[PDB]
């Protein structure tokens, strides 16, 4: 109104992003101060809402922060807060300062993640341990552990109960020769005093995620029983008893080689990430980063493999170079052969220098089959994504036959009628299947045998079938992503 022209634009009111079809769910603990209701899926908007909505320095907030840092605009986020167990016990750590600073200098620490680092300058010489331990005044609030500064020794207590607070290995690169003069005589000692006790075991996924489709599930926990429940729920999404919502889940397992291999329960619906015992980064942060990267922030193309240093780079995570690879090459091969995911540094640098991790292989911890003999049909995450994409695409294509007249006894269609018979239906489907080669399928082994169409009258006995019901059977192969060639050198020496 009050303006001239032909076109009248109607801008979408503040829906600056679509973010539809791509959804990610993050599940984890919270603290008392969180205002969000427990066991109720809620939509997360941005970093501003955090802290207030999910407490200060909680596992859920820490996981979400990384997710948003990886997934800036392409995906929509969701959260499912959970409360602590009834009788959870919080872990306790001790960091004692002993010496007396007899020379001006600076002290810097690295715990859990690079975002939580600190750097404070020692006031002057002859400052005792009591004046030291000012580190407590410098620790960032977001750190999941609470500092106390008990007059010479600082105590770190986990803000969340349960086993989730049993992962630390502090790196303190000051001691030894340093241009930033290390306060001479000061030495730090690190030890644990009390572990975590009890984790929750929610089992009500059917109620809070009832008939809602999610592309990726991320779980910030290490309880095997909790993970087992999540796997069971995912199976139900891929079940044949009802319309399917599909989906995939990401979890992590930490420990020695013997322990990690014991968790391989042939889960085709999960991608278990294997970590060593001395990982210098808090576990659930890395798992969240991997999930966010693959949670449709890169996987809008179902066939894209998240590997290598170009696509599988967890940029948001920075950790110092370790003195030993952690996973010996003899152990890396075994983990990959057993369906686990292994990650390592992206660039080689001297000991103590900062780097970033990247992912070697994208595998779904799938081995064997219901029919017990082995195969590798779902060995790669891309296979699961492609299988889901094919189902949706095929279902859409067949919609055109809905409500169409079908002739089955007398196959001659009169002049002017709009209809079809079995052979014409099969021919059209074959055209579609062959056209998609190179997009959703590889070259069919024998296209004349891998597709069949039979009317229900030819399956059921006499006077038991129904009219206008068909059975379609199709067998396909995902695109090839490898090849092995053996070579010989044969350096000749004769003239001819």
């Amino acid at each position: 109104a009050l303006s001239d022209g032909f076109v009248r634009l109607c801008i979408d009111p503040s829906l600056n992003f679509f973010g539809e079809g791509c959804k990610i769910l993050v599940e984890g603990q919270i603290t008392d101060d969180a205002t969000a209701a427990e066991n109720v899926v809620t939509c997360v908007n941005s970093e501003l809402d955090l802290v207030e909505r999910f407490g200060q320095g909680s596992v859920l907030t820490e996981s979400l922060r990384k997710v948003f840092c990886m997934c800036k605009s392409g995906v929509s986020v969701y959260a499912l807060p959970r409360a602590d167990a009834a009788a959870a016990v919080s872990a306790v750590y001790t960091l004692t300062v002993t010496g007396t600073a007899l020379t001006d200098g600076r002290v810097q620490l690295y715990m859990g993640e690079a975002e939580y680092s600190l750097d404070i300058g020692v006031d002057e010489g002859d400052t005792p341990t009591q004046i030291a331990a000012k580190i407590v005044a410098a620790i960032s609030p977001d750190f999941p552990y609470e500092a106390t500064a008990a007059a010479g020794v600082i105590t770190l207590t986990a803000r969340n109960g349960g086993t989730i607070g049993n992962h630390l290995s502090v790196i303190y690169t000051n001691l030894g020769s340093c241009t930033s003069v290390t306060p001479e005589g000061v030495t730090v000692a690190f030890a644990q005093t009390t572990p975590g006790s009890v984790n929750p075991e929610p089992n009500d996924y059917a109620s809070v995620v009832n008939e809602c489709c999610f592309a990726v599930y991320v779980l910030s926990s290490d309880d095997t029983d909790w993970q087992e429940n999540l796997r069971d729920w995912i199976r139900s999404a891929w079940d044949c008893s009802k319309p399917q919502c599909f989906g995939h889940g990401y979890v992590f397992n930490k420990g020695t080689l013997g322990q990690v291999l014991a968790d391989g329960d042939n889960s085709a619906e999960l991608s278990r990430l294997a970590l060593p015992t001395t990982y210098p980064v808090l576990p659930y942060l890395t798992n969240a980063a991997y999930g966010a990267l693959s949670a449709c922030s890169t996987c809008e193309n179902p066939e894209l493999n998240v590997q290598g240093q170009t696509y599988g780079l967890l940029s948001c995570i920075n950790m110092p170079e370790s003195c030993t690879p952690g996973w010996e090459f003899t152990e890396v091969t075994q983990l990959q052969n057993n369906g686990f995911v292994v990650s390592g540094p992206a660039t080689t640098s001297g000991q103590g220098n900062f780097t970033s991790p990247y992912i070697y292989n994208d595998v779904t911890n799938y081995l064997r089959d219901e029919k017990n003999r082995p195969n590798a049909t779902f060995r790669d995450a891309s296979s699961r994504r492609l299988a889901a994409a094919t189902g949706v695409a095929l279902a859409t294509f067949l919609q055109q036959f809905n409500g169409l007249a079908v002739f089955t006894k007398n196959t001659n269609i009169k002049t002017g009628i709009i209809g079809t018979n079995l052979r014409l239906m099969l021919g059209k489907i074959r055209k579609w299947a062959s056209d998609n080669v190179g997009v959703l399928f590889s070259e069919f082994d024998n296209i004349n045998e891998d597709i069949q169409l039979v009317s229900d009258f030819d399956v059921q006995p006499k006077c038991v079938g129904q009219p206008g019901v068909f059975h379609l059977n199709m067998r396909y192969r995902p695109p090839v992503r490898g090849a092995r060639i053996n070579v010989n050198l044969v350096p000749a020496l004769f003239d001819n």
Binding site: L404, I413, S434, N448
Partner: protein, 133 residues
Amino acid sequence: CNKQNGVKNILITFTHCDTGEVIGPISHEQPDDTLPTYKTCAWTNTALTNGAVMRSASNATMTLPVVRDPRVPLAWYQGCAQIDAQVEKFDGTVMTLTEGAVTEPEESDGRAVTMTIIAAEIDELLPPGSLAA
């Protein structure tokens, strides 16, 4: 009866280009004793010297003589609309075509229309028991 050589069904789907209208597959009937013809190999060989050849692009074409449906404008059967066709012979063969176009239309008296169609590829469904994959 499998040795009989003839046409059993002919379905055509029209998609008007200036309005986007779509008309479901309508059965058709042929005007005379002639049969449709096919060319599926989308590469042409030219004879060089001493048994060699030359490859050229070419296309896959279909000639489809059908009787005009009295409920569809005569313009559509000519080069004023897209065509999707299917032909099923008595033996069992089915030949499908999609996104075809009509070329160099000729005058028609109003009942008999002979359509020349070209498409990227034509898919063939041989009867059960084929040999090639």
